[PDB]
Structures are given as C-alpha cells and as structure tokens.
Amino acid sequence: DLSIISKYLLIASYICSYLEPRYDASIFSRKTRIIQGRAAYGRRKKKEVNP
Amino acid sequence: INCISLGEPSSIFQKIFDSFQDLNGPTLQIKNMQHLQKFLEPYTTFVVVLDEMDRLLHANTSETQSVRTILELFLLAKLPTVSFVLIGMANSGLLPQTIVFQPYTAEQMYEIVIQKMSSLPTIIFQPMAIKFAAKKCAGNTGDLRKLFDVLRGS
Amino acid sequence: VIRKFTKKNVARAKKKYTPFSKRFKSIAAIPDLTSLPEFYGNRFENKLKTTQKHQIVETIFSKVKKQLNSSLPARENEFASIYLSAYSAIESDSATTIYVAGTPGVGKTLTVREVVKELLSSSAQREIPDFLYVEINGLKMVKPTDCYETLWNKVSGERLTWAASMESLEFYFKRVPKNKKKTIVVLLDELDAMVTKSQDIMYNFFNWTTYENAKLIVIAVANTMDLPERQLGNKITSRIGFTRIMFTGYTHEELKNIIDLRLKGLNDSFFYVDTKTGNAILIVRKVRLRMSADAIEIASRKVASVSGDARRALKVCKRAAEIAEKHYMAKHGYGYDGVQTVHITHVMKALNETLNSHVITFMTRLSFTAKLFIYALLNLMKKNGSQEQELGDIVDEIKLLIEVNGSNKFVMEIAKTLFQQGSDNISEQLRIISWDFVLNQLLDAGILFKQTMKNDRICCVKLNISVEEAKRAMNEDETLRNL
Amino acid sequence: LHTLKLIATTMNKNIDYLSPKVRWKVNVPWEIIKEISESVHFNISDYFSDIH
Amino acid sequence: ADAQRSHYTVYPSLPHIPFVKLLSGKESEVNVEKRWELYHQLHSHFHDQVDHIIDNIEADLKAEISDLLYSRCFNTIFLLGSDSTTKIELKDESSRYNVLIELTPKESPNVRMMLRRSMYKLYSAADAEENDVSYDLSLVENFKRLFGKDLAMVFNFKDVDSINFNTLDNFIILLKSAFKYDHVKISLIFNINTNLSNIEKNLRQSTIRLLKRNYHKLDVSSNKGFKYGNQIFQSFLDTVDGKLNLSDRFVEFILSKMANNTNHNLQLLTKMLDYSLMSYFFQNAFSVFIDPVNVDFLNDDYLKILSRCPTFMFFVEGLIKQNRGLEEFFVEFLVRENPINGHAKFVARFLEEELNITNFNLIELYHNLLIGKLDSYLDRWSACKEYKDRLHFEPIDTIFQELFTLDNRSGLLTQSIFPSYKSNIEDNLLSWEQVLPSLSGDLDKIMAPVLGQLFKLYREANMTINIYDFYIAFRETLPKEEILNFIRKDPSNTKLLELAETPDAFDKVALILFMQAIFAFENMGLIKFQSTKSYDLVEKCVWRGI
DNA sequence: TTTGAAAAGCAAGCATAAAAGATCTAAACATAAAATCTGTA
DNA sequence: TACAGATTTTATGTTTAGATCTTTTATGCTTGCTTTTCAAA
Numbered sequence A: 001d002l003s004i005i006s007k008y009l010l011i012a013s014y015i016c017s018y019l020e021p022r023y024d025a026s027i028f029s030r031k032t033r034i035i036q037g038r039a040a041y042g043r044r045k046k047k048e049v050n051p
Numbered sequence B: 001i002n003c004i005s006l007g008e009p010s011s012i013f014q015k016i017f018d019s020f021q022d023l024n025g026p027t028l029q030i031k032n033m034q035h036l037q038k039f040l041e042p043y044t045t046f047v048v049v050l051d052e053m054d055r056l057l058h059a060n061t062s063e064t065q066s067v068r069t070i071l072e073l074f075l076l077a078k079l080p081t082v083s084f085v086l087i088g089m090a091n092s093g094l095l096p097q098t099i100v101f102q103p104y105t106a107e108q109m110y111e112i113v114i115q116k117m118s119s120l121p122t123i124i125f126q127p128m129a130i131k132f133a134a135k136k137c138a139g140n141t142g143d144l145r146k147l148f149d150v151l152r153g154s
Numbered sequence C: 001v002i003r004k005f006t007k008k009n010v011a012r013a014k015k016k017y018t019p020f021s022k023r024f025k026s027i028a029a030i031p032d033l034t035s036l037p038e039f040y041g042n043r044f045e046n047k048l049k050t051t052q053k054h055q056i057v058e059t060i061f062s063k064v065k066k067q068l069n070s071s072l073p074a075r076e077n078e079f080a081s082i083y084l085s086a087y088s089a090i091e092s093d094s095a096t097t098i099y100v101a102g103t104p105g106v107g108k109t110l111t112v113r114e115v116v117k118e119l120l121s122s123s124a125q126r127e128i129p130d131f132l133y134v135e136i137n138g139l140k141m142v143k144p145t146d147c148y149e150t151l152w153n154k155v156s157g158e159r160l161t162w163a164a165s166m167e168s169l170e171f172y173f174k175r176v177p178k179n180k181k182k183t184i185v186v187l188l189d190e191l192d193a194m195v196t197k198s199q200d201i202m203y204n205f206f207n208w209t210t211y212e213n214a215k216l217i218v219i220a221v222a223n224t225m226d227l228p229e230r231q232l233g234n235k236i237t238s239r240i241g242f243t244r245i246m247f248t249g250y251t252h253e254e255l256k257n258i259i260d261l262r263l264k265g266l267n268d269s270f271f272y273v274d275t276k277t278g279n280a281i282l283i284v285r286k287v288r289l290r291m292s293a294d295a296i297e298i299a300s301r302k303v304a305s306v307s308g309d310a311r312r313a314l315k316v317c318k319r320a321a322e323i324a325e326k327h328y329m330a331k332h333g334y335g336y337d338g339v340q341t342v343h344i345t346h347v348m349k350a351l352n353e354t355l356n357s358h359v360i361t362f363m364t365r366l367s368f369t370a371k372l373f374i375y376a377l378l379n380l381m382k383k384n385g386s387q388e389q390e391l392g393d394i395v396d397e398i399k400l401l402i403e404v405n406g407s408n409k410f411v412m413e414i415a416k417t418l419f420q421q422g423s424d425n426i427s428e429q430l431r432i433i434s435w436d437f438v439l440n441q442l443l444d445a446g447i448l449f450k451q452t453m454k455n456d457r458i459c460c461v462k463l464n465i466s467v468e469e470a471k472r473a474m475n476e477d478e479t480l481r482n483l
Numbered sequence D: 001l002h003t004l005k006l007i008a009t010t011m012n013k014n015i016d017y018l019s020p021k022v023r024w025k026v027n028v029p030w031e032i033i034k035e036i037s038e039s040v041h042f043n044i045s046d047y048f049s050d051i052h
Numbered sequence E: 001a002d003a004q005r006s007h008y009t010v011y012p013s014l015p016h017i018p019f020v021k022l023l024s025g026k027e028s029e030v031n032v033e034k035r036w037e038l039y040h041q042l043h044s045h046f047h048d049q050v051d052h053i054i055d056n057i058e059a060d061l062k063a064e065i066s067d068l069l070y071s072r073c074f075n076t077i078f079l080l081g082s083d084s085t086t087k088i089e090l091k092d093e094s095s096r097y098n099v100l101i102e103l104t105p106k107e108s109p110n111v112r113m114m115l116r117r118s119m120y121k122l123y124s125a126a127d128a129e130e131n132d133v134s135y136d137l138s139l140v141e142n143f144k145r146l147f148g149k150d151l152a153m154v155f156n157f158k159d160v161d162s163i164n165f166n167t168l169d170n171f172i173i174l175l176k177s178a179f180k181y182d183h184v185k186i187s188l189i190f191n192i193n194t195n196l197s198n199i200e201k202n203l204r205q206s207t208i209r210l211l212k213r214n215y216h217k218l219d220v221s222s223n224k225g226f227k228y229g230n231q232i233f234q235s236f237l238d239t240v241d242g243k244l245n246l247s248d249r250f251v252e253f254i255l256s257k258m259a260n261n262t263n264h265n266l267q268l269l270t271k272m273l274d275y276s277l278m279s280y281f282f283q284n285a286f287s288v289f290i291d292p293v294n295v296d297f298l299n300d301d302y303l304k305i306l307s308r309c310p311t312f313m314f315f316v317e318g319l320i321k322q323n324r325g326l327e328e329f330f331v332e333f334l335v336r337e338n339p340i341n342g343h344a345k346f347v348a349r350f351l352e353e354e355l356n357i358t359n360f361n362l363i364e365l366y367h368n369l370l371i372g373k374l375d376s377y378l379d380r381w382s383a384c385k386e387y388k389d390r391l392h393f394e395p396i397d398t399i400f401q402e403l404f405t406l407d408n409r410s411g412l413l414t415q416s417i418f419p420s421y422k423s424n425i426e427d428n429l430l431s432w433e434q435v436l437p438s439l440s441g442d443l444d445k446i447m448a449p450v451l452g453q454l455f456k457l458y459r460e461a462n463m464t465i466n467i468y469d470f471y472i473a474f475r476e477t478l479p480k481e482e483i484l485n486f487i488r489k490d491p492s493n494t495k496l497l498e499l500a501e502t503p504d505a506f507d508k509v510a511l512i513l514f515m516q517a518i519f520a521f522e523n524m525g526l527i528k529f530q531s532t533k534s535y536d537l538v539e540k541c542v543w544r545g546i
Numbered sequence F: 001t002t003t004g005a006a007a008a009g010c011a012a013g014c015a016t017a018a019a020a021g022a023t024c025t026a027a028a029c030a031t032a033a034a035a036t037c038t039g040t041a
Numbered sequence G: 001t002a003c004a005g006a007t008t009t010t011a012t013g014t015t016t017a018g019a020t021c022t023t024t025t026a027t028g029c030t031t032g033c034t035t036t037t038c039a040a041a
C-alpha cells in the first residue's frame, strides 16, 4: 500500500544504486540546448556480470 | 581545603559548610550552588583557599561536564548579596585575577636559605656551597624542594 | 516488590562513615592521642596445629636446606643512609619521605625492616621518642584505596570506609598538634601497585609528608628508580624528592658471603648419623658435612651475572642440596617416617634445569601427524615467507607431501592410516586422522597461535616458538629429514 | 522510506541525516522493485537490458 | 550571555483575540468578535464529530483484533498497514491468565533482552493480579506451579519493519520451545507497514513454515476501503452545509494530498480542512453573514466589495442585455439550501446500503458532483446502470457564492502546509529583490547582498569550485570606489579609516565578505569542503529546481 | 554530404577516504547492607 | 535518652550510547590511449 511518491523514490533509488552516475546524462537528458553543448556518448561495452 | 583529599569533587560545598558552621547548631545537608548561596546570605567575610583547584575537574566526561564544579564556584564567588572571596592555587568579564608564581633563581634561593637558617646560631655551610647548590638546582623551572634535599643530603 | 535483578551475595563490612574531624567539637577539644587506649595499637594461629604421631627423620642435608630458606653483610651504606634519615627525622619530630628502588631480591624489605627494628630498639632506650610502625604492601591490598583503610586503622583503632579514612588521615596529619601525637613510620612496599589512574593515593601519601604537624616517615620501596618520572606527575615527583636510594644487585663475593653466613655453623662440621634410620644430630657414625667453595663461587658468579638476586642464590644452593640428598636417600633407602659433600656437579645440575628448554624435546616426542603439521607449516614459511599461513594451505601441503613421497616405505604404510584409519569401510577424508587433535594440542602447548576465525580454511596459524628450534626438532626425526 | 528500511545508509544508529558524508543505498531486492514497478506501470527492466 | 548558552528560561515582564480588522481597517470590532465566535462554533461542531469518528476507529479495531485473536502452534496475526498505536486489551476469563507483552525494536537489541523484558512483564502482571524468579523461559515452565493458572501470552511486536529480523527469527524459534508445557498458548501480532512478502524473505523458511500453521491477515490502514475518511469528509460537509461551499480546486487539492500520504492521511485531511476554515474566517469580512442574524449590519464597503462578483457580474450583464434594491437582493438571495451536500449524502447512502458498493471514496464523488460528472464516476462499477437517471444531478451556479467558498487559487494552502522548501530557499537566494525592498543608499542599489551574489556565482559554476578563483569572480562584480566611499562614511570608527587607508583594503573587505558567505553556504548545506585539512576546493551539493 | 577534431569514454596505477567492527568506557538505570539522621514516647 | 522508621552512604551490578582505533576495501585523481557526434567547409 505504498505511496506513488514512495514507489517512484524506491525506483529512483534502485536506479541510483545499480547504475553508474557517469552515464546518467546519456539516459535521462531530453532538454533543448540553447547553448552549444555535447551530451554524453553513453557506455561503450556491456558488463559481463549483471550488477 | 585541599581538593585531592576529598572523596568526590561535588561534596566541596558541604566541606566549606563543615568548615564554617558551629558544631552546636543544626548541621544541614548541602548539595550544590543554591544551598551554600542561601546559607551565606544573612552574613563577615569567608576566605576559602582551595589547594590543587584543577583536580576539581572530572577526569572522565567531556568538556561540558568537567568544568561544572569550577564554573559553579567561580559564579558563586562573583554574584552579589554574598561575601565570598575565593583563592585557588593550581600547578603549571568575571574570569579570575591571575598571578603566575615564577620559578626561583639562584639569588632568590640563596636569600631564602640564609633567611631560613638565620634562626640557627652558626652556619655550617660555606656560602659558596649554597650559591653553587642554588645555581645547579635553579636552572629553568626550578623547585626549592630540590635545593632542600640537596642541602640535606650534603 | 518485584525486582529487575537481585544481588543475593552482598557482604558489607561493619565500617563507619563519619571522619575524625567530627569526633570532637574543636581542635582544642582533641585529647592527647598517645594517652588513649585504642590509638597506636594499645587469633587464628591454633587452627593449623595438631598432634604428631611419628618421628620425622631429618637427614644430614635437611639442616642445610632449612638454613638455606628465605625465613646484613652486604648492605652497610644503604642501612646507614636509611637509618640516619629516619633517626634524624624522628628525633627532631619532622616528616620525610625516603625512596628505595631496586630489582627483586636485593634486600630492600630486609634492610628497611632491620632499620625499623634498630629504631625501635633505640626508642626502647629513651634515645628517640616512641613511634608506631605501619607496613602497607600494595600487592596485599584487594582494592588500592584499602591502604587508606589500613593506615587509619593502625593509627586510631577505628574501622572506617576508605574516603572517610582518607579525610580522617588528612585532618590528623594537618590539624592535630605535635604535643598530642606520636610519630608514624610507614613502609609503602610495592609502591607501583598503589599507582592508579588519578594518582590521588600517591599524592596524598607523599603530600602528608610535607605537612608541618604530620610527624610522618614514609619509606617507599619501588622497583625502578624512574617510577616518578615515568608514571607519576610533576607534583608527586617534586614531593618525593631528588634523593633516591638504589639497591644494586649483589656481586658474586657478597652472594658468597651471604651463603657462607647461612652455613657458618653447618659447613665443615660433624654430625652423629644413625644408620638404622638416617636421622642426623649436630654436635652411629661421625660424618662431616661439606659444601665446596668452588660450587658456591660458581653458583654466586652465575646468579650475579643473571640478576644479583639473593633468593636465586639461596634457591640454587637449596636445590643442589636437595639433589644430593635425593641421591643419598636413594642409595641408603632411608625414608621419611664418612664425608657427605654437596658437590659442584649438583650445583651445575641445579643451574642447568633452570636453563634447559623442553620445547625441542617436546616437539621431538610428538606423533607423526603433529610433526607432519609442523613440517608442512615450515615448508609454507619457506615457500612464501608470510610467517602466517592459512590452515587450508597447510591441509593442501600435507596432502601434497603425502602424494609426492608416495614411493617411500613409511609414507606408503602411513597413507591408509592417515586418510581412512586403516579401514575399508571409512571414506577418504579431507583432513587427516587426528587433525583437530594435533591442532588443539599445539595450541594448548603454546607452540602455535591461531586467529579467531570461523572459516576453517582461511584461518591463519603462526609459530609462537622460534623457527630454528622447530627446524632442529624436525631434523631430529628420521622420516621428515629424508623427504 | 528510510524508517521502513527500504532504503538504507552507511550509519545505522545515531544517524546525522543532514551530513554530506552520509550516503544512501537501496535496501530492497530486484523482485520487490519489479513488483513495485509493475504496480505503477514503470518499465524498470528497460533500464538494465542494454548494459549487460 | 543568553546567546551563548545551550538553553535558558525567560519570564518576560508584562505591562484580546488574534483576529484583525478587515475592510481596510474600517470593519467594526464587534464584527471581528462574532467572526471569532462563528469560527469557534464551526470548529467545535467539526471536531466533536472527528473525535467521535476516531474513537469509533479504535473501537472497531479492538473488536476485530479480539475476534481474530480468540476465535501446538502459534496464533499469528499480521496487522498490515499498522502504525502500532492500537491499545490491545485481552479478556478477563477465569482459570487462565492473559498477558499482553509489547516489544519494540529499541527494546530488542538481542534475543536475551527480548526474553528478559518479556519475562519481567509476565512476572509483573502475574504478581500484580493476585519470592524472586529468574527472567527466562523456565518461568513459563513453572507458571502453573507458581500461580495455579494456565497461561496465554499475546506478543505484540510494534513496528516490525524496523526490527532486526535475525533477532526476531531467533526469538520466535526460542518461543517455539514453550509448546510442550501443556498449559501455555502463544499468540503473535506483527504490525507490518510495507507488505507481507518483504517480511517473508527476511525470515528463514522453517520459521515461515512454523508461522503458516495458524495465521490470519487483518488489513487496517488509515483508508482501508475509504470508510473512515468518508465519515470525516461528510462531517465537514454537514458542518458547512447551507453555510459554505467547496470549489472543485479545493477538493482536487485534497485528493492530491491524500494520494501522497499513506498511513496518516486522515489527520492530514483534517489539517487542511481546518486550515482552510481558519483562512476563510481570518480573510473574509462576509463570514459574519454566515449567521443570518447579522445581515442588518451592511455598509457601503460591503456593497462595494460584493459588487465585484463574477456571477453577479454575469447576472447584471444578462439583465442589461435582456442600492436599497441591491441590499434587499443580497438579503433575499443567500437563504437557499445549495443541495449538493444533501444529494451527495443521498448518493452515498444509496450506493452503500442498496447496491452494496462499498469501495468508493466520497471525496471523488463530491468532486464529480462539483464538476457535473457523477455519471462519469458512477459508470465505473457497472451496477448502477438502471439508476443513472435516478441519481442525476446538475449544480446551480448561484450568485455571490464565491463570497462564501473554500477555494485554492492563491497557493496559501500550498505555501503553508506543503511548501516547496528547497525551491523557495533557492528562489530567494537567486532572486533577492523579491525578498528585500527596493528603497548608505548608493551602495544598496549598486551592489547585491553577499549571499545572493554568492549564489548567482555558485549556480553558474561547475560541480567542483576552486575558492580562490571563486573569490576572484566574486571580487570582479563589486564596485571598488563605492565600497571605499561606504567604508569611510563612519568617522567615529578610526580602525575602519586606518584599514581603508591601506592600499590592499578592497581585497581584504572582499575576502571578509566572501568568507562569511562561504561559511553561511556551508552551514545551509549548499557547499561541501573536500578534505579536512585542505580547505581549497568545494563541491556543490545543491542545484535549483531538482 | 564530408571533415576532423575536441569532447567523451576506457583503463592501469596509486594515494586515500571510508565501511565495518573489535574493544572499550561513560552514563543511565538498578539494587542493597550498614550507618546515620529524625520525629516522637 | 531510647528507639522505630526514613534517608544517606558506600558499593556494586545491568544495559545502552557513543568514542576510538585498526584493517580491508571503495573511490577519486593522473595520464595515456581509442571512439564519437557536432560546428564548420
């Protein structure tokens, strides 16, 4: 019977625990750049073991 | 009053009361600041000399509770409607006045020795021996007890 | 009421709480304490007594052993200094501290007790005023504050708790005038044992000697000359003083004189020995007893090299006499109910058993499994040099040593015993037979150290003994040195 | 969420919540967060499909 | 000084209602007094009903717990969604003694303390009803010898989602040993706040198999089936019926806030209802006309304010398309019932009793009746198809009904009860001219407050900031000559003039103003120093709008 | 439509922060026998 | 003065809150190398 904010906070905490923070801009960034800027390239190689 | 020769540092107020009240009268039971402050209010000057005031700190606890008794005594020797004058001697806007006692020099030690043995009929030391003992015992941070044991051992 | 816990074995003494400062109304109300029937010392012995139904046979060496027991030829300058300081401070009614330090058994307590005995003899001749002698041993106290309970009980005869006793002693030493007092001589033996964290006891005992009305002599016996500099504060070091008396360990000539003084009347003397029983009488055969001057000299030189400790020299001579008496009683068959000499051989055998090490001959008499464990442990220390080896690595290396020297005769006879206990119905085992037994045996012997870990494989094990004596014990074995 | 121990911290007792040194971690297994994400129609398995 | 103490008590020397004068201060004080008295009648008539509802909540919870509790294994009850604030009382039945043992995670650091506290509670209760003992399970063994009665222990584990589950598992396995004593029966109550599946995976499988032999689930959240919040909302409807009306924005805000709280949204609902009533009786000068006795106290200010009503605006615009009379019109047209509350109560009692539709929330029903979509709310059940024409209602947009309304448009409810705290701090830091008025006059216009300038340079910098470079960037915006003119404008202070005479004065002033603001930012939590003994770089901890 | 090149990502190495917990002590909480105060008889 | 009762003193046990120090493991910076998308030809 958890709240919607509590559920989305748990989902975001699971993502923050099990995803490296260097790549977050390559998943979540969606804004229009008035200023010239290069988004993240994203991860190159897959992991071998499920984190 | 010597603070080390008490049982607990919290009883010193009571000790001051057992140093002042007449034995024929009612002996009250005293805990803290307030009962001593109420007792000295109808009075006459009270001189207390407290030797070793630093061992009034609690060696345990922390900075908040080790300086409980000393701050309480400094506040109780500073407020009006009492006549409580407090002298404390430890070893090396209401803060106390400070005189630092200085370590004795060779000439001071010499003068102390001849003043002490001036009660004697003769002096069985050569004065050069006392001067040499004083200059070796003084140095830096000297104690007159060391000079006394050097002369006694001589 | 229902308690949260119970204290059902509380044993509380009958000790009062009121200190001596409330015993009289004023300072002038204090009477002369010397003319009081409880001050200054004004039942269990018979329970250890019985009736003797036999006649103990004392052989000729029994008097030598009795005279060599611990129950002043080499301490003249120390005696004179302590006695002169105490005599001067007693006769002039002053308070002082005398400091004495030294290694064990160098005659500290004996010299101080002799000084006190001579001062009591001089006070019995009305040459110095009377004093009370109190002996406080800090190792004989249960709690360190009990010295406060002891000294005050020796002074007043009362029994107070320790804080009230401390206030009572403070008031007594500071406020009671000298005309109503007696001098007190206090021996503070084992002074390091009364050192606590707050050091209040040390400060109080050495600060009472600085009071003008105290009439207190504190003789503090210590173990090191630098105890106030190492463990005490500047305040207590200032009060103890600069003059300190060092008791040096005895040279071999003074140990020689001590042993000759214990045997002045026995050595080179004749005894009437009854050959029926063995009982000897000091002036039936006339037998002369002799202990060699070379034997006493070599024991004294050895002891003076080690410590200069008179207890050790007396014990070495007593052990030599015991060895000779055991051989004599064995060869004559006497029981307990022309020249008898205790020789340098007995002295050397007494000196050798204290210097012999049992660790090597303990390890050479172990089973093959324990020796195999130690050998594999030394092999792992040779392989990686870590000095701590995991037990699983020891298991694997024992298994490797079994399967590598498999063509050896003893190993190919031992393998079935080691892994199946000689039985076909027993499966091949991951540990050898008696693995836990020899591991725990080496841990109880102190040969091994084991960390507190719950995983048996990664738990580390260390040699506690020296490595080369373990290697010597391993090369003593026939099987292990060939593989 | 910290009270229920669904999230946790490096320190367990006498916690300085406002300390920058204190860091936070999730304290639920993957099946619990899977059922939670299925209760709100969030595609959490799409976030881990491309990384291993 | 009192500013340097940890705490101090002040008994201040002294030499009648918190309501102020409305109508630009031309309201009378007697209208203020009856505003206060009308607010207190409405508040009391609401909270008596709320108190009765809360007592009913605990009463039926006690009844359901006792029914599930008394009608060689544990009797296990899982109270799902429980805040562990229910007072469980056991029966008084002869020849057997019933003990309630309450255990908290603070009272449970290990199994030994759990058993010792439970056995102390057992012995204390058994001694209190009608020789010391050891506080272990043998007292359970020897209970019939020591007290002559059989034993029923009920263990109430408060806040199970905070306890160490290894300790709780070992304590349950320890309590399993009492099953062989023939006079002992044990009930366990677990107050679960997350889910049963979470506590399933935190326990051993043999412990689960032991608990599975006799167990029941009892779900009591704050809004289990919406039945208890509907009573609070209906009592609020009855206390303002014919007197005030609810906007759809206010009901929408209420539903949104109750969606964001799980365990304590009943008290939250009462909190926003009372704060809205407070805001009306503090704001509206027309609330005295809530009482129909006070209508003769009209003034020109009242008629001037009530003329600016959009519903009255549309009414008079329709009249022109097609004071005394205005006074009589205002008197006559506030009498009517506004039957939305009676129709909502009728629909609620029709759905609850007749159709046995019980999983409905009255608040969204009232929202749909407010926006005219009661059919669009009712057609989600497929059971009132034959009664859609029966329960049809359309609201009547009466005129000057917004002078008596509870409506959320200013964001006063958002600012007071659920503020955007961090966003308000960042907005006040970044845009300080919405804080400080725009009235040493030359410096106050040409140079910003130091905290705001520091936040402006903070926002446009990287994650890691070199504070020397940061201090140079702060120094380039400050005016030098105006600062030196401002620092010399105090001729009584000569040390200020002496420091202003030095050629390195502006760098020192900039460093002082920079260091004060840097420590303010560190205390607020914005910046974090990297190392303890370096103090050369900072990390931003805070970004605006996130 | 290319270009190319500067930003982004990988990876070994290494100093260093920090998590975990072993060990310990202060403080709150708790009990208790002997002594000492206290109000009456 | 004697005395029963209440309180204090001295003395120790029980439990929780927190500090310090060590050891092992995460992590952040350095530096060199490879891939990649974005602002001009």
Ligand SMILES: Nc1ncnc2c1ncn2[C@@H]1O[C@H](COP(=O)(O)OP(=O)(O)OP(=O)(O)O)[C@@H](O)[C@H]1O
Pocket (backbone or CB within 6 Å): C069, C070, C071, C072, C073, C074, C075, C102, C103, C104, C105, C106, C107, C108, C109, C110, C111, C258, C310, C311
């Ligand atoms: N000069 C001596 N003459 C004869 N016997 C001596 C002499 N010195 C020591 N002893 C013997 O050795 C024993 C140990 O001496 P004592 O008790 O004085 O030693 P100590 O220095 O106090 O040692 P510890 O520090 O171990 O207490 C004495 O009881 C005595 O039997």
Ligand SMILES: [Mg+2]
Pocket (backbone or CB within 6 Å): C108, C109, C189
């Ligand atoms: Mg001795």
